[PDB]
Amino acid sequence: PARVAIVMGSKSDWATMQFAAEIFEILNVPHHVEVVSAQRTPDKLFSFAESAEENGYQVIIAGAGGAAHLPGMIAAKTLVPVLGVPVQSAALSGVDSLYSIVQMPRGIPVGTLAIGKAGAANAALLAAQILATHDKELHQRLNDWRKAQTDEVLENPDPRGA
Amino acid sequence: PARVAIVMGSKSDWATMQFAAEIFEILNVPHHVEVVSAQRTPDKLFSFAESAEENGYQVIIAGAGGAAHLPGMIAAKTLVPVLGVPVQSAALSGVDSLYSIVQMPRGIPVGTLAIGKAGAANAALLAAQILATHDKELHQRLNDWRKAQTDEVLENPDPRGA
Amino acid sequence: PARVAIVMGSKSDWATMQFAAEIFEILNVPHHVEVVSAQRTPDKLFSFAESAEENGYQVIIAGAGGAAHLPGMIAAKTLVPVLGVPVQSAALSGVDSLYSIVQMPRGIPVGTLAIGKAGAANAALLAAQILATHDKELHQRLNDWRKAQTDEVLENPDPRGA
Amino acid sequence: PARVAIVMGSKSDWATMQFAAEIFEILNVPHHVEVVSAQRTPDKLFSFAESAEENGYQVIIAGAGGAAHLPGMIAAKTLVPVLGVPVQSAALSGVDSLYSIVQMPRGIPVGTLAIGKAGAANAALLAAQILATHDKELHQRLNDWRKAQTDEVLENPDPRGA
Amino acid sequence: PARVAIVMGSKSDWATMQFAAEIFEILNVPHHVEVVSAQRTPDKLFSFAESAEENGYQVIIAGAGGAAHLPGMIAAKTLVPVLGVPVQSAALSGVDSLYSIVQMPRGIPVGTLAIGKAGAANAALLAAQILATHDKELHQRLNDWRKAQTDEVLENPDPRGA
Amino acid sequence: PARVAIVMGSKSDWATMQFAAEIFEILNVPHHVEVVSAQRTPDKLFSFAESAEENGYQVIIAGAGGAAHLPGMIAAKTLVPVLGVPVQSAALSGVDSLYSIVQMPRGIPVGTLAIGKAGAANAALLAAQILATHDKELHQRLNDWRKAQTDEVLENPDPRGA
Amino acid sequence: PARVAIVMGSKSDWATMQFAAEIFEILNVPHHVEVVSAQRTPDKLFSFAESAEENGYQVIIAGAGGAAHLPGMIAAKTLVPVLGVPVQSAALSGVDSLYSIVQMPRGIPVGTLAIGKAGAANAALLAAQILATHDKELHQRLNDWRKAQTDEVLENPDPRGA
Amino acid sequence: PARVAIVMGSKSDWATMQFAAEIFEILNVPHHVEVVSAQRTPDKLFSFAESAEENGYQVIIAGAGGAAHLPGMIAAKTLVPVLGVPVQSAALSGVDSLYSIVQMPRGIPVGTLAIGKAGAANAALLAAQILATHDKELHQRLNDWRKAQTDEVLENPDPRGA
């Protein structure tokens, strides 16, 4: 039973969003992946957002580049937490993606993560921390993961070559 | 028969969008004004956009501030030309409004005008020039208007006080 | 039992963060408010973050202006979801607050909301949607709230004065 | 009879503007292409703009990079709708192109599209939607095109490799 | 015989451009002031630029705000040195004025000064230094002026109140 | 007798500044080239600026990247017109170069040209137009050059391949 | 014996730089204040920088707004540590001040603090920490100060009114 | 006895921070290098900062990219001068690194250097100038170094190829 959905406005966003999925694979969290566009498939987005709850999703991670409307439009149609991932656009290096996602006016929110791939991974981690709140097992895996990332740095203090 | 519609995401946008309407009043162009929000009234926006053509609109002028989704969402649902007006937001002085409107990816366009009030007036003028293409009378009024703005500057070359 | 904590780097941030609390009051969600600074009270922040879970918090909302370190430092010390609120700084109008919060590298996330007051309210709404996932009652209040914001716009389509 | 003109300040802009023309080819819309510069061929621009109407153009698409003056200067000389396309400049990645085109003060407008190639295609699509208003056939082709772009996404929901 | 001309796109620019004129008054340099707009009075601008040399102007100072086209259009039509002054716009605080003036592509230049009033004064000073090259008297006044500005600072080293 | 000097803060700036010199070669204008740094050779800069007039220079073109101090420091020490050329820096793509050059406060000016190579060529053209004011021959060559750049565009209107 | 000097390009900078001095007063650190401009008093700056060491200064704090050259020019002439303070400019809100100070190329550094007043205070604190390295007494006062700022926050955790 | 410490948030920062170390090697200044992350190794950072003084460090140079918290967190925990180095991030080219480091509010400072490698070298030079204050020998080496960089430019005035 997938409790988290990863959507994006175009398959060209997959080079970025694959990092969110990679986190779910490492953490063994079931997840659904799909290309949904508020701009190119407006009706499927509405349909998708309206059935998000009945489908069992507790968190939705939406990525888009440029004038990103996907995240906000999904949020406007559901009470399921939506996390936004700014994909790096060619011309404005994701700054346009960032502003169009994070600058939501009062009433409909979207938790936004960093521009690009680091944000893809983080949105998955954030979604995982949200679920772990009521899943002791995942919570344990999440703590194992953090343990690993920390010790990796600790056991490798000197950046210089031997 | 109103051939142009002026929508905005919030009545707080009216302080800006009133300048678009002022142009239509001066040019005697019938127009419809309404607050439609892709974020707060998503279903009314869909309904609105889908019936835009059958309603007789040939141009739509949409204004929004911050992460502006209104313009793009309307454009995604209709073939009626959509002109975007970036409303000046408090924190980013409309830069977030501008990027979220103008940076549309390939497939669904939005002709964007200047940030703020000057853009409101211009979107109305642009819409008027679009209609004048098949309305000799309005075309004449538009030329009278341009004549007036030009001569006003011409007959007042010295900015200094007498 | 407060399941959500609202922290900020300075009481000068309260003029902004009060809007997050206002949402919790309207939605009748118990909440804890406190001024914690990663910069001025580093030890209390560590202590605070480390005991967040044992204290019962399921979401933490942290606001800061300028070079905002509070959100990221709390996130680095706990698995409790952290939502960041960029407070509007004088010189860079919150852009420095925004970048220092949202641009977290891979490993420790922070769901970021809009700059300023609109972001304060939204972070509370987002936190509320996170909790509502396992609280049918709050979920109902959240839907009542959205219903109200939508109908308010619907029953007031003409921005012009009567 | 070409009802739409595509101009640009330099043939170096063609790598970008070719995408506008590609749309007209797909949609079978007659079009004129020409390099006109307000900066390097000021007199030909005036001559060009002044005869735009008598030449039968109903829409003009102008692309320029850097301090783009072409779009605004054409608009100042004709009532024919002008759509601006910000070409990506080396140093400012088209941000200078964008501001010099979209930030027109009150009186002479220019509908601006996205920076770069996506904007080139969109300006053509926008111009096509303007013409389709009084051309049922093109309107039909435009709807066929949108149908195709939408179903392409719909019939390919999973971005992952088989 | 006025050897320097001060033009601007609108009399609303005078609040800024008056500082350029103030320099000429202090330095006793004859000068012509006039509101010329490439956008609102395109033909008068052409006429103006084409006759600049025969009129005796050796330097032209042009100020404009927003998408400033005035400076570049004048430069495109004459060999008389053109200095640009970015007027502070409301929304983008003159950044749009700055980019549209300074970012001229190869072939037609415009020496650009600071945004706002400080730039107005400086463009006049720069123009004065250009003329002083072949005017020993003005050159002397210019050196007297610099002497005065320097000693004013020198004879007042402590910013604190007595 | 070289009437114009081209200086730069580092020989790494030559890849850019060579375009200014190329203009002088085409226009047959004697010129001096030299690497002077306000930061690395402060005393030689002072010495250089103070003797600029006695050396016969009527215009100085200074290029620098990053926090560019060269142009302003030269201007502070001489009455000889100084034109600034923002060299494209790695991190901020010349935006830091641009602001540190153009944003001079009241009293000491610097005519600034576009970021990068296009600005290098233009500063040379601008300097040439300044000299041509009292050199009919160069003025003629300058007009021949403009004639050539214009006709090149005119005789090549179609950007498409034959 | 003043071991730290506070300079600024104009007495108009005092409204900002007074906060640096306020720190020295609280910490009882002798200090010299003076208006020195690289742009308006270039020779006094050279003289000043060259004698900084023989005068006993161990740290220099320089503030400037707009295209700030003061900090860098002082650093180029002395080995005494120079700390830069970006004064908030009207048009670019200190962003131009910031880039012109912090973006120093390799060879001559300037430790830069925050834009505006907070940066003024911090540069003084940083200078104080530099001196405290070889002054146990000041080091003690610095620790008393930090103690006070921390406990002030600690003993006032609830931002709300009683 | 190493009197200066060079830390960074990740070994991926070494490609940049190696330039700081290179300066210490040339100047023969003992130094400690280590990867410390406020985000990934929060406890080791605290431990590290708290023992900085007892370890003999008189200056700390911290580099980080993106939302850089390392510098500020170290500064919050020690009185040892901290110099920040903005590492160039992929998406925002170090602008996010710069703002998150330099924009520290009143109370805890961080002397910030240029974005990237030039800043790495400079922070080392600045730290060296701080130490040289009480080390005549290093002070001499520092002056030898500056002598060399200056004469290198002086003895190579013509950037052109022989």
Ligand SMILES: Nc1c(C(=O)O)ncn1[C@@H]1O[C@H](COP(=O)(O)O)[C@@H](O)[C@H]1O
């Ligand atoms: N911004 C959106 C939306 C939306 O907001 O609905 N749909 C697609 N996109 C973005 O368009 C960019 C280019 O897409 P293509 O590569 O298909 O041209 C992608 O980054 C996508 O996320």
Ligand SMILES: Nc1c(C(=O)O)ncn1[C@@H]1O[C@H](COP(=O)(O)O)[C@@H](O)[C@H]1O
């Ligand atoms: N961006 C949008 C949308 C939308 O994109 O659908 N709906 C409203 N808004 C913007 O929210 C801002 C603040 O609105 P309120 O004053 O009601 O808080 C307005 O500028 C509106 O255009």
Ligand SMILES: Nc1c(C(=O)O)ncn1[C@@H]1O[C@H](COP(=O)(O)O)[C@@H](O)[C@H]1O
């Ligand atoms: N950025 C931080 C941190 C932190 O990151 O720990 N602590 C306080 N601050 C910010 O300092 C700004 C000015 O605070 P003061 O008004 O006390 O000078 C506030 O916006 C606070 O959030």
Ligand SMILES: Nc1c(C(=O)O)ncn1[C@@H]1O[C@H](COP(=O)(O)O)[C@@H](O)[C@H]1O
């Ligand atoms: N901005 C303008 C204008 C104009 O505004 O009239 N004419 C040319 N350009 C731009 O100059 C850039 C470089 O042109 P070149 O490659 O010929 O140097 C192009 O992007 C063109 O659009």
Ligand SMILES: Nc1c(C(=O)O)ncn1[C@@H]1O[C@H](COP(=O)(O)O)[C@@H](O)[C@H]1O
């Ligand atoms: N940018 C230009 C041009 C031009 O480029 O020709 N003409 C006027 N303007 C600018 O329009 C702004 C607002 O003018 P108004 O106050 O008349 O609305 C002014 O800053 C003017 O310089």
Ligand SMILES: Nc1c(C(=O)O)ncn1[C@@H]1O[C@H](COP(=O)(O)O)[C@@H](O)[C@H]1O
């Ligand atoms: N900004 C200045 C100054 C100055 O302002 O005096 N001197 C050199 N520079 C710039 O340093 C950059 C890197 O120089 P290097 O390649 O030698 O590291 C160049 O763009 C130069 O113009």
Ligand SMILES: Nc1c(C(=O)O)ncn1[C@@H]1O[C@H](COP(=O)(O)O)[C@@H](O)[C@H]1O
């Ligand atoms: N940037 C510099 C320099 C310099 O760099 O030498 N000298 C003065 N200034 C700045 O000019 C601004 C306006 O000064 P005025 O108020 O006298 O016009 C101030 O912020 C000063 O620091």
Ligand SMILES: Nc1c(C(=O)O)ncn1[C@@H]1O[C@H](COP(=O)(O)O)[C@@H](O)[C@H]1O
């Ligand atoms: N900003 C910080 C912090 C911190 O602030 O504690 N720790 C690491 N980082 C930055 O993360 C970026 C990417 O690191 P990785 O290459 O490991 O993904 C680096 O620039 C590091 O300085």
